Amino acid sequence: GDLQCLCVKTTSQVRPRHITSLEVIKAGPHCPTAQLIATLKNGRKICLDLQAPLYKKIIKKLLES
Amino acid sequence: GDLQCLCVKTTSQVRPRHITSLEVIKAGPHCPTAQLIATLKNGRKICLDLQAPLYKKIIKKLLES
């Protein structure tokens, strides 16, 4: 149980066409919960919300250029 | 002001053979400690020390290819 989660709090402002990666780290022995880290255009890692249809919508804006 | 550190435990003991990739993260705003994670050959991540001169020991063994 050494290593821990890589997130703290959710982000309000979300820029659909300003992100690159989306590391979706599922629950593990380390972090008791899942993770949605995205990398920004400038290279700034942020965490997001799961519940809301964030990604459901964000995917398109990533896949369609 | 989110994004927590990945490491909580330093550790030094490890196999210089059974490993894949290693990275060092700079002391950022989100994470103040000097991060040193390494992806295991079996599918796990572990942390290391700064002043413990055993990180270099493994690096070299990977370039032997």
């Epitope: 821990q4 989660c5 997130c7 703290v8 709090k9 959710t10 972090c31 008791p32 919960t33 965490c47 799961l50 519940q51 809301a52 | 989110d2 927590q4 550190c5 909580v8």
Partner: antibody
Amino acid sequence: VQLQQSGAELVKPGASVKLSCKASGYTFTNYFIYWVKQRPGQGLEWIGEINPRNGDTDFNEKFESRATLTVDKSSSTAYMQLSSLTSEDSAIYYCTRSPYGNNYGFTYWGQGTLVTVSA
Amino acid sequence: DIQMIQSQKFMSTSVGDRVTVTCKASQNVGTNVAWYQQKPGQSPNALIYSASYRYSGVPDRFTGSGSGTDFTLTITNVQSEDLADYFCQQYNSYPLTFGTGTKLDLKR
């Protein structure tokens, strides 16, 4: 143990009781701390939250006066006194934690401390 | 203060039964729900969050359902170990609110 707690005891109505809570790791300074008492007859009630970095809280309005939180960066410590007891303060108190700072449920809890009112 | 209405509080079922912990919201919380497991005379253990997403190291038996004002917790196969208590949660507005509890008894 990561979230230890204080001993169980009773006190007189209209008094003050000081609790204790310790943690292990950086999983203190960033994460929001929470306090809850177990009746256990009726159910569970929320007292409030408290930021470890700043000091800003946000108590429950019904049980605001019967509450006082002071977080000390000494050794990951979190205390709670009680401003004047009654008789309904008979509930076991917890020092809980949450995984995404101040949201997404309550992961770690702790042993607890049983408090009653009679004298 | 919102409160979460738990219709059933005292239930009982056999070895391997589908149980449905009824929990309806007074006002809207929006999926921000949590289920817990209180062991007899022990601290409530983290069960599941957002009536779908399960925590680390939680058996497949536990399953959440519903969204908004209506939520449901279901369980496929039960064992002697799974005998305890189960609570209800909402986390969208401070102060955050709990419930009442729903105990169960195993038939043997």
